[PDB]
From a paper:
The [name] from [name]-[name]-2 ([name]) is responsible for cleavage of the viral polyprotein. PLpro cleaves the viral polyprotein at three sites, while [name] is responsible for cleaving the polyprotein at eleven distinct sites, including its own N- and C-termini. [name] self-processing is called maturation, and it is crucial for enzyme dimerization and activity. Here we use [name] [name] to study the structure and dynamics of N-terminal cleavage in solution.
Here we report the cryo-electron microscopy (cryo-EM) structure of [name]-[name]-2 [name] [name] mutant containing the nsp4-[name] cleavage portion, at 3.5 Å resolution. In this structure, we glimpse the in-solution state of [name], bound to two unfolded [name] protomers during N-terminal processing. The final model showed all 306 residues from [name] [name] visible for both chains, plus clear evidence of an at least 11 residues long peptide occupying both active sites. However, the cryo-EM structure of [name] [name] revealed a dimeric particle of [name] anchored to the nsp4-[name] region in the moment that precedes cleavage, with detailed density of P and P‘ key residues. The electric potential map around the active site Ser145* indicates a non-covalent interaction of the nsp4/nps5 peptide (residues SAVLQ of nsp4 and residues 1-6 of [name] [name], SGFRKM), forming an extended β-sheet maintained mostly by hydrogen bonds at Thr24, Gly143, Ser145*, His163, Glu166 and Gln189. In the cryo-EM model, we can see Gln0 occupying the S1 subsite, with its NE2 side chain moiety interacting with OE1 atom of residue Glu166 through a hydrogen bond (2.7 Å and 2.5 Å for chains A and B, respectively). Additionally, OG atom of Ser145* forms a hydrogen bond with main chain hydroxyl group of Gln0. The Gly143 main chain amide donates a hydrogen bond to P1’ carbonyl oxygen, stabilizing the oxyanion hole during catalysis. By carefully inspecting low pass filtered particles used for final reconstruction, we noticed an elongated satellite particle anchored around each one of the dimer active sites regions, with size and shape consistent with a partially folded monomer of [name]. As expected, the analysis indicate that the highest conformational plasticity is concentrated in the active site region of [name], with the highest RMSD concentrated in the regions of helix 43-53, and in the β-hairpins 19-27, 62-65 and 166-171.
Residue numbers in the entry:
A (entry chain B), B (entry chain A): 1 to 306
C (entry chain C), D (entry chain D): -4 to 6
The structure:
Amino acid sequence: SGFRKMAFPSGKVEGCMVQVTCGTTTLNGLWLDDVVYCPRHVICTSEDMLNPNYEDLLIRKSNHNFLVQAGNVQLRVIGHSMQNCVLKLKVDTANPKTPKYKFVRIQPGQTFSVLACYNGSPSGVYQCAMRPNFTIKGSFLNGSSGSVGFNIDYDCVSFCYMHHMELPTGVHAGTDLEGNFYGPFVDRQTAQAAGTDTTITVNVLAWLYAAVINGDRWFLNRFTTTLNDFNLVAMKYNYEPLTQDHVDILGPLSAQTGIAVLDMCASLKELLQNGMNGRTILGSALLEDEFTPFDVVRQCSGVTFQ
Amino acid sequence: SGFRKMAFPSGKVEGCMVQVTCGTTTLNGLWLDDVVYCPRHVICTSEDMLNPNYEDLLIRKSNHNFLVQAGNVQLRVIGHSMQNCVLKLKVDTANPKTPKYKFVRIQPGQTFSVLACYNGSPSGVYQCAMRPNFTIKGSFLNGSSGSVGFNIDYDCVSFCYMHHMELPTGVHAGTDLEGNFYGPFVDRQTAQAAGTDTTITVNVLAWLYAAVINGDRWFLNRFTTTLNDFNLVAMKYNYEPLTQDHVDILGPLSAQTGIAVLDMCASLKELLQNGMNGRTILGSALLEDEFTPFDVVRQCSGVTFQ
Amino acid sequence: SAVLQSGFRKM
Amino acid sequence: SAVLQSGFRKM
């Protein structure tokens, strides 16, 4: 049994990151084969933090200005290039620990295990959910840029994130390994605020599925409501609307637990209307919403490895 | 900023575990140097579940009956022995990835990152807190025995747990690598129930420190109460009593945030008496209590690596 | 009763 | 204001 914030193993990602330094500005970089993917903040002094000119700054920097350290190993930068909003530093050494990697741009709501790092030493790993406003509620400090988020399935790693900045409201922002940001953010110290945060409904449904399977079934009731009424109530309660695709992806959980999707949709609607009533579901008094159905399946009674 | 359930990196522990099999009963084991520490559940058929005779069972099993698999690598069992409630299988191959390991028996309330595993493949890693009733609220299923919990400091790993059983109330139990249980349990399918669960006060205070430093300071107030009154209120609210040592270990956080210990003790007492009043502290509507002050220091503004 | 775990491996 | 991050290493 048991159910809590469980993150993927990190060794395959622990052994594939280095420290990238330019002058007095350093950060973490994701090392794959003979390439190092790093945020382009590396070529930025403190005085030009407001409106960096990344083209001019990159065309000013040289090959030897980039310093790559894999623990205590020194790496030479054979070449450097920029794509979108990241830098690929072609290095002379191929990483022996690089696993089967994919660069996927995950849609909002899909969770992933970020590897919080500082100066090339993995500080830790924890789950995060890509919010609909295209931010992550991670725990990062100065020097944590380049802390990649990833998924692991069938012993294959898919990197889907690279941390870049904190928003003033406390949430964090990042790119994919291709370079494009997640959202309308810009790579400069300009006043940027994410949109209104909306709680993900499908993740809540997966969390309720996990609660039912674990042994907590007080919220279940015989009452059943249609999809459209549930969508209206979620909209007036600031939750993401539920589509047919979300019900379709919940099919394995419905088969595993034996409760139909609409039944727990009605139960969830009633939970919103009457509140949580003061009691507790699996150690949380608020609806946890960073649990995808795939994560529930691979973490609950299913015995999926990685 | 940011603050959530952050667990230690696992690669140094991912690369040091194998699968131990006897007949039709398999499970996970911790491989260190030329030794494999496994639960003695491995020598257990389904029929003798009530009162296993581990001495007779071990004296009946032979060396070749134990099968050790490191992924796709087959390991020969040179010898086997029992200590307390674990088996050390001396194998012919020394693990090249074994790090500096220590076997520490953590006191209740000290958190640790369990590496949930299934059939030798690391399924994931997540934080857990050793409850005062000497249980952990982990997420484990069948075949997860041997999933070691560990801490990492100064790139040195200290194993402090090994999962063995689930209690009927839903919490899990385990040993240390020395073999002694954490609590009054017995290693058999006998009806065993843990005592009344008590929330750890020092961990709550550390969580409040993290909330204050992160930027949430609504609960703070000028009211201040003595230690004895706070202890009485915690006792009548089913929390662990607070001693002088707990205030002493909280010193670094007091210096970092500038808030006196008794001030937040009074604030916490008032929170207990008046409830949480429906608002939220860092995504949780209940007092999180699996955050040690050391974990807060190494996770918050402190830039400690591993 | 305890649900003390180990894997149920075939063969 | 954005808190665009990197390391604050000296030398």
